[PDB]
Amino acid sequence: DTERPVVNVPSEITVYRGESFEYFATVTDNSNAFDLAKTVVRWLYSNQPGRGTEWLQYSVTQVGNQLKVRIFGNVPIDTTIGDYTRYVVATDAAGNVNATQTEMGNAAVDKTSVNGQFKLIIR
Amino acid sequence: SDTERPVVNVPSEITVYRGESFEYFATVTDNSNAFDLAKTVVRWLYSNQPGRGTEWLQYSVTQVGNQLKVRIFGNVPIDTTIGDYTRYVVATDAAGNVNATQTEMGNAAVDKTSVNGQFKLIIR
Numbered sequence A: 001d002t003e004r005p006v007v008n009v010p011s012e013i014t015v016y017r018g019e020s021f022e023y024f025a026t027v028t029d030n031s032n033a034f035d036l037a038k039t040v041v042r043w044l045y046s047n048q049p050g051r052g053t054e055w056l057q058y059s060v061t062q063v064g065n066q067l068k069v070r071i072f073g074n075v076p077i078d079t080t081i082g083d084y085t086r087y088v089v090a091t092d093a094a095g096n097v098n099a100t101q102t103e104m105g106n107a108a109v110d111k112t113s114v115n116g117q118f119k120l121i122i123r
Numbered sequence B: 001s002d003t004e005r006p007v008v009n010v011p012s013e014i015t016v017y018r019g020e021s022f023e024y025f026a027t028v029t030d031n032s033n034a035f036d037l038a039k040t041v042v043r044w045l046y047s048n049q050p051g052r053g054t055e056w057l058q059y060s061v062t063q064v065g066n067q068l069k070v071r072i073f074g075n076v077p078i079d080t081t082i083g084d085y086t087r088y089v090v091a092t093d094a095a096g097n098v099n100a101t102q103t104e105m106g107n108a109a110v111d112k113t114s115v116n117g118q119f120k121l122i123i124r
């Protein structure tokens, strides 16, 4: 298997201070199998949710041949509002990833996006 | 001996504005580093055209080294419908392997999932 998985996520997810949120991303792959230990919702620098979005959580289930990545959390009242680039990073059973760290960095430089990239919009 | 598909790197969203010009770029790689540029296209699901209501969507293809470069550009009519459109970068390697087949594009469309090279044209 040399074909990488493909994530389907809303380009932008809008959340609000003092409120809970729940969104869903879907992942497919030619193999229909995934490495859940290597599937995460994270910011650019590490597998963490990120500064100012420390409360961003995720849960992974599989329904048929598709991953269902739940993107959820509760937004504290004292949150800094703004826009936060985050990523649904998914790995198939063979270790192919939807977006590499180099692809993510290149896209940030060029003000563009990679597969699985989305904006968490806090208002 | 080449069974590995070419891979398109395209922005998942291409945002454009009525009355303005736009320009984005995709790249294509392949283990063989060889392609059929004549079979590389930007198009909608059904056929080889820019798509209903988005016929002003243009593209050009070059090869720089081991990678295809696909310019995605144009001018947006002042009166074009506001909304989102699903389009595709479809590329072919020298061995005839495509990054996404018509069958795969159709199956993905009914499920509302995505294929490699699929992207959303956002008009505002």
Ligand SMILES: CC(=O)N[C@H]1[C@@H](OC[C@H](N)C(=O)O)O[C@H](CO)[C@H](O)[C@@H]1O[C@@H]1O[C@H](CO)[C@H](O)[C@H](O[C@]2(C(=O)O)C[C@H](O)[C@@H](NC(C)=O)[C@H]([C@H](O)[C@H](O)CO)O2)[C@H]1O
Pocket (backbone or CB within 6 Å): A043, A044, A050, A051, A052, A053, A080, A081, A082, A083, A084, A085, A086, A105, A106, A108, A109
């Ligand atoms: C701080 C910075 O400029 N970082 C760059 C740089 O990163 C590596 C770093 N220098 C290092 O020491 O290792 O280089 C990479 C490319 O390799 C990036 O360009 C990186 O910049 C960040 O890139 C990410 C990519 O997702 C975003 O574009 C970051 O900008 C934003 C965003 O998340 O979209 C802009 C936004 O206005 C900011 N929102 C608020 C509310 O502050 C957010 C946040 O600051 C961060 O997301 C952290 O929560 O960043 C961009 O800074």
Ligand SMILES: [Ca+2]
Pocket (backbone or CB within 6 Å): A001, A002, A003, A004, A005, A029, A030, A031, A092, A094, A096
């Ligand atoms: Ca795969």
Ligand SMILES: [Ca+2]
Pocket (backbone or CB within 6 Å): B002, B003, B004, B005, B006, B030, B031, B032, B093, B095, B097
């Ligand atoms: Ca190939």
